[PDB]
Write a protein that binds this DNA or RNA. Structure first.
Lengths: 283, 263
DNA sequence: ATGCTGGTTTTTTTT
DNA sequence: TTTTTCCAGCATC
């Protein structure tokens, strides 16, 4: 239920969001937004970003060939235990590997068997992807030639690649939305590592092949012109039909089901225990 | 001209329009148009009354800068704008220390040692921190010339507390906002608390406690010494003036850096 | 439909 | 000669 705004002023109007363009004033209820995508020629006010962050909404600045910038709130969860579970899973090598296995395995339509050697799955994924690219290139009619990322080549982005990248930007925005709205951290990456938003990519990879590739190929099969926008429409139709944002939330919760384990008391750490917070102690 | 702390510089902008102007930041306010060099800019702090442009965030994202939507004087923290170039080595170090009981205990003892010499105990140190808080309370109750510390508040009822209690709580909120700002501006997590574990802002409280006894308590007691009308606002004003007179953000960032050094 | 004014409705060694 | 000069709700009739 995300919303894309370009060439408009976004401010807080009447306790909600107001987008001022040449058409006048459009008011949008912030209840179901998830992501507010700001295209080029857009200015937003401190109050609008404050309200969106407070309502557990993320702001994603997408561009005309640029980087990715995400505005991050504080989440809908009051004091997330989910984050403590994420940190414990990330910090323990065995649980870490288990989460990595989970993330790789969830990308296959037909579920896999239990006996399946590690680092083989990480290679099996690769053929799926490649065969999905080939499947939709044969289906639509658009030649593939591979993705624009490789080594030793700065081959120009063909339209399908550009559609892939735009839809990827939007999918990453939604991934960030669900991650920070459920109280997780984008920085605790399991497959992607080193960046404060790695987990976003970890989550988005689970739905790239299911939603992005068909939308991009179907958009380039008809257009080859103005894809960056029509891919957004096709991806919107595919996300609000499969109820992705809810599915993502479900996967984010169920993803950590292995190890162990109001709203203003507090706490106090002890060795494998905790004392009550907010009390005087000494003599 | 913009002040740096250790490495990159930072900027607080309020009551202005932020645009990109000539490969840099352009600030349109009542004073006109001001140029800020984006080259090596860690955090750009947006106060209320600032609206930004798609081009400005594009330029900031390309240069690896983060934006922090904060309240007036950074007493409140509202939102973080980050890009994909932001490194998470400090965050990984904090998490690794937090998840291992030995390193966890070591960092907790660091945090305790920063508020005082030392002693040698396990669960009495909590009582010693208690006694420190209480006798500092008593000191500033005497010097201010007022009632006692007490600290009797009800979360459900704001006005069901002492005037000094309300001032104390307001100042605590201000310190928590500034702590949250400095914590996430250096790339750490507010939820990875070593003391106060269990809250998503535990580390914020951990950091704010390091400066409560030096900034919050005297400000609250002296504000109640001024009057008992609008204490909540006066204490915040006096704390703002005392934070800008003591460069508390730089000290906070420096201590946060040294907190995970050599562990 | 026009001045104004405050920058957000707080608390985590309280019980 | 190629825009940006604080934003938004409160109080008043």
């Amino acid at each position: 239920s995300y919303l894309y705004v370009e060439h408009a002023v976004v401010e807080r109007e009447a306790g909600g969001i107001g987008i001022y363009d040449q058409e006048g004033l459009t008011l949008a209820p912030v209840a179901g937004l998830g992501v507010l995508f700001l295209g080029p020629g857009t200015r937003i006010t401190h109050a609008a970003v404050r309200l969106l962050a407070e309502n557990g909404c993320t702001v994603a600045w997408v561009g005309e060939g640029m980087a990715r910038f995400y505005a991050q709130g504080l989440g809908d969860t009051r004091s997330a235990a989910r984050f403590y579970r994420q940190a414990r899973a990330w910090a323990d090598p065995a649980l870490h590997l288990e989460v990595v296995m989970r993330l790789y395995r969830m990308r296959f339509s037909e579920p896999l068997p239990e006996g399946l050697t590690l680092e083989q799955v990480r290679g099996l994924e690769g053929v799926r992807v490649r065969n999905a690219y080939a499947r939709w290139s044969r289906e639509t009619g658009v030649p593939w030639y591979g993705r624009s990322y490789d080594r030793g080549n700065w081959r120009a982005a063909d339209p399908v690649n550009r559609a892939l990248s735009a839809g990827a930007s939007y999918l990453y925005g939604l991934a960030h939305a669900a991650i920070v709205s459920l109280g997780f951290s984008p920085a605790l990456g399991f497959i992607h590592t080193g960046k404060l938003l790695s987990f976003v990519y970890d989550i988005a990879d689970l739905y790239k092949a299911d939603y992005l590739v068909p939308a991009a190929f179907r958009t380039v099969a008809e257009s080859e012109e103005a894809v960056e926008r029509r891919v957004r429409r096709a991806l919107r139709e595919a996300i609000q039909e499969g109820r992705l944002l809810e599915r993502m939330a479900e996967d984010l919760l169920n993803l950590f089901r292995g190890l162990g384990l109001p709203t203003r008391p507090g706490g106090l750490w002890d060795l494998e225990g905790e004392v009550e917070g907010g009390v005087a102690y000494g003599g």
